[PDB]
Amino acid sequence: MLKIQAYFNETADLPCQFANSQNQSLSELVVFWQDQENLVLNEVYLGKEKFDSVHSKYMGRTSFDSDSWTLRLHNLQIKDKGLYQCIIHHKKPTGMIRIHQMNSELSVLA
Amino acid sequence: MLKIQAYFNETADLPCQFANSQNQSLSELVVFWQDQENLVLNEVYLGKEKFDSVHSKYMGRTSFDSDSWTLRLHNLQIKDKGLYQCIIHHKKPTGMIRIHQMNSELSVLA
Amino acid sequence: TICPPRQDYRYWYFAAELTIGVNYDINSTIMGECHMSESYIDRNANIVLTGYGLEINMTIMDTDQRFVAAAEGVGKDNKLSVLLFTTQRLDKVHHNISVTITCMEMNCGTTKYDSDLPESIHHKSSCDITINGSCVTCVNLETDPTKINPHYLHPKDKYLYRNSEYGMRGSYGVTFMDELNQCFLDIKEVSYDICY
Amino acid sequence: TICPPRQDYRYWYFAAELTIGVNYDINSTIMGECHMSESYIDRNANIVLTGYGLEINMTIMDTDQRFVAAAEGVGKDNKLSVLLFTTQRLDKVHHNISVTITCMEMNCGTTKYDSDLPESIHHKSSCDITINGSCVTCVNLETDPTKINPHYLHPKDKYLYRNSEYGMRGSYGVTFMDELNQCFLDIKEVSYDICY
Numbered sequence: 001m002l003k004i005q006a007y008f009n010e011t012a013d014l015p016c017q018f019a020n021s022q023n024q025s026l027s028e029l030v031v032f033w034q035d036q037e038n039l040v041l042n043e044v045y046l047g048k049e050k051f052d053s054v055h056s057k058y059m060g061r062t063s064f065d066s067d068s069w070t071l072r073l074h075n076l077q078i079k080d081k082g083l084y085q086c087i088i089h090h091k092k093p094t095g096m097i098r099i100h101q102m103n104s105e106l107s108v109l110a
Numbered sequence: 111m112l113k114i115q116a117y118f119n120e121t122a123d124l125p126c127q128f129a130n131s132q133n134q135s136l137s138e139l140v141v142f143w144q145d146q147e148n149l150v151l152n153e154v155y156l157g158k159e160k161f162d163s164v165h166s167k168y169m170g171r172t173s174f175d176s177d178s179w180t181l182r183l184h185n186l187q188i189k190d191k192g193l194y195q196c197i198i199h200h201k202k203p204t205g206m207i208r209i210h211q212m213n214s215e216l217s218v219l220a
Numbered sequence: 221t222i223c224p225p226r227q228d229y230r231y232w233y234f235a236a237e238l239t240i241g242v243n244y245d246i247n248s249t250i251m252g253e254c255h256m257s258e259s260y261i262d263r264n265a266n267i268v269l270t271g272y273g274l275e276i277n278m279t280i281m282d283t284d285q286r287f288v289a290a291a292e293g294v295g296k297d298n299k300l301s302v303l304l305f306t307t308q309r310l311d312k313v314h315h316n317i318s319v320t321i322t323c324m325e326m327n328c329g330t331t332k333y334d335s336d337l338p339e340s341i342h343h344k345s346s347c348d349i350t351i352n353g354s355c356v357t358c359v360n361l362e363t364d365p366t367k368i369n370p371h372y373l374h375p376k377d378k379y380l381y382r383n384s385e386y387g388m389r390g391s392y393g394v395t396f397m398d399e400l401n402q403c404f405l406d407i408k409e410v411s412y413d414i415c416y
Numbered sequence: 417t418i419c420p421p422r423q424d425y426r427y428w429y430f431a432a433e434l435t436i437g438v439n440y441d442i443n444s445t446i447m448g449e450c451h452m453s454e455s456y457i458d459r460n461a462n463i464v465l466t467g468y469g470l471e472i473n474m475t476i477m478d479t480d481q482r483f484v485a486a487a488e489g490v491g492k493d494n495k496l497s498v499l500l501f502t503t504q505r506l507d508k509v510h511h512n513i514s515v516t517i518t519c520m521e522m523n524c525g526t527t528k529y530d531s532d533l534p535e536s537i538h539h540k541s542s543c544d545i546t547i548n549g550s551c552v553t554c555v556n557l558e559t560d561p562t563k564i565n566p567h568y569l570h571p572k573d574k575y576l577y578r579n580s581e582y583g584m585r586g587s588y589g590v591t592f593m594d595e596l597n598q599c600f601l602d603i604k605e606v607s608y609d610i611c612y
């Protein structure tokens with residue numbers, strides 16, 4: 001329900017609008033942003049960024065913001081149009097339960 | 111039961127003799143006149159003439175009269191001989207019920 | 221003239237037709253879908269035939285006729301045409317009719333229509349229609365038809381008759397969508413498998 | 417709209433899917449392994465289907481739907497995908513769901529998980545998951561899917577519908593291993609033999 005359009009080779013922002021009804025902290029939650037091929041983009045494991053699986057193409061090009069919960073991606077391409085997802089997990093002692101998911105779509109001038 | 115004969119390329123009149131036992135108004139009733147191929151000729155939706163489906167050949171050629179409930183058709187042709195029907199519908203909130211139908215036939219000199 | 225025979229199976233047929241326009245999806249005839257039950261015992265003719273997704277329950281009051289057989293087919297744009305073959309006509313009195321269409325698949329529900337159709341084509345007979353469900357967009361009933369009722373004129377042994385006097389045909393109709401008059405035409409890919 | 421028909425076998429289908437990621441070994445579909453039992457009597461829909469090594473017991477509260485059928489297949493990396501076909505949708509209310517996965521071969525045990533999944537994708541419905549045993553590594557449940565649910569679109573006679581409104585889909589998930597999101601993808605060597 002959130003479509004983003006960007007001018008040619010412009011910068012892109014992917015938010016996923018977590019309500020946070022319980023007022024939890026980033027240290028008890030993990031966040032994944034993934035593309036339509038399921039390859040990961042970025043990860044905040046217990047609050048510290050991890051880059052153990054980001055594909056080289058996405059390495060470094062992405063940045064995170066704490067208060068805004070938004071992923072800032074640079075260097076757009078015509079072939080980078082597609083869908084992206086913000087899968088949020090709550091890391092309880094027993095397991096991880098998915099407590100948020102928000103689909104977004106981005107396209108480029110052609 | 112009503113056959114109409116007209117001289118070569120003469121004008122034609124199609125009535126359908128609605129008894130109107132309940133003494134209703136044209137605003138609560140709709141009327142269609144159709145040919146033997148099921149293509150519509152004219153339509154009085156809630157009393158206002160509508161021309162959203164009349165085939166171009168019949169556009170403008172037909173005229174309506176209120177008191178007489180008769181359709182006046184101009185520009186007869188040898189190939190326009192056939193059957194015609196006067197379907198009257200009563201547009202209640204629930205739906206439309208057909209409360210009159212009259213078949214007529216017209217032929218031209220040959 | 222007074223009596224009908226009350227036989228097992230009739231070699232002599234007649235006609236009366238109707239068509240139901242439903243919104244859920246029907247592709248083609250299934251060759252064995254229909255199943256009908258007929259009765260006359262009460263002095264009133266009756267036939268309940270269950271088919272593609274709805275059961276049609278038709279009854280004629282003061283009839284002197286009994287439904288010999290029926291046929292059912294599906295055409296274009298989700299229409300369902302049922303022909304009904306009655307024994308033989310002894311008199312011209314323009315009977316009343318009662319038809320209930322109950323949706324048994326994909327739109328079940330309680331009653332949504334309980335009015336009567338005036339039929340002022342001659343203004344002598346009235347039909348009462350009751351629809352259970354929401355699987356109806358058009359209903360047309362032609363009594364004493366003059367069209368070519370016979371499907372594959374004619375079955376191997378039976379003989380079939382059809383009215384040819386305009387003064388006896390009647391048309392009852394009710395539509396909920398917009399201007400669907402002449403809800404369907406007979407001679408098409410209609411297969412018309414016998415209703416049993 | 418009020419009622420469902422309560423028929424024998426349904427020509428009209430729908431969809432809702434889920435996938436269980438188990439650690440013991442499964443190679444390929446066996447063509448006749450699954451066996452399912454359905455019920456509606458209590459006002460709540462229910463389906464218990466026993467398959468490759470676990471029985472899945474799913475229940476929908478205040479449903480107006482009944483599970484017509486199901487299908488089950490096995491993919492790559494020991495995943496088990498079960499599609500569930502329900503009759504038809506009468507309303508949009510976002511029912512709750514209760515699913516219990518009981519391991520019946522190679523890792524039996526007593527209860528190891530009894531929490532509830534919030535599903536804040538819209539944050540209207542909650543699913544309660546109970547797992548007996550240790551033969552689970554991922555659980556995903558997609559309600560009102562928009563993907564291509566139909567396996568071999570479509571079985572010989574049945575008709576199948578699938579939701580196309582994003583506002584109604586829901587996703588419930590729980591994982592014990594590390595970052596197994598999107599636990600499996602549909603169109604693969606998945607055979608999808610009918611579940612009966």
Ligand SMILES: *[C@@H]1O[C@H](CO)[C@@H](O)[C@H](O)[C@H]1NC(C)=O
Binds near residue numbers: 277278318
């Ligand atoms: C058919 O309708 C009549 C009245 O219209 C009713 O008495 C009868 O029970 C109906 N038949 C069935 C099988 O429901």
Ligand SMILES: *[C@@H]1O[C@H](CO)[C@@H](O)[C@H](O)[C@H]1NC(C)=O
Binds near residue numbers: 373376377378379
């Ligand atoms: C009987 O003859 C009539 C006309 O010759 C024909 O319409 C009908 O099909 C025949 N029936 C049989 C059983 O031969």
Ligand SMILES: *[C@@H]1O[C@H](CO)[C@@H](O)[C@H](O)[C@H]1NC(C)=O
Binds near residue numbers: 473474475514516
């Ligand atoms: C399925 O689960 C329900 C409650 O979740 C339970 O009452 C029922 O007995 C279970 N069915 C079986 C076959 O165990």
Ligand SMILES: *[C@@H]1O[C@H](CO)[C@@H](O)[C@H](O)[C@H]1NC(C)=O
Binds near residue numbers: 573574
């Ligand atoms: C019915 O037709 C639809 C579309 O034409 C098709 O998707 C479906 O498979 C058909 N079903 C049968 C039994 O022919």
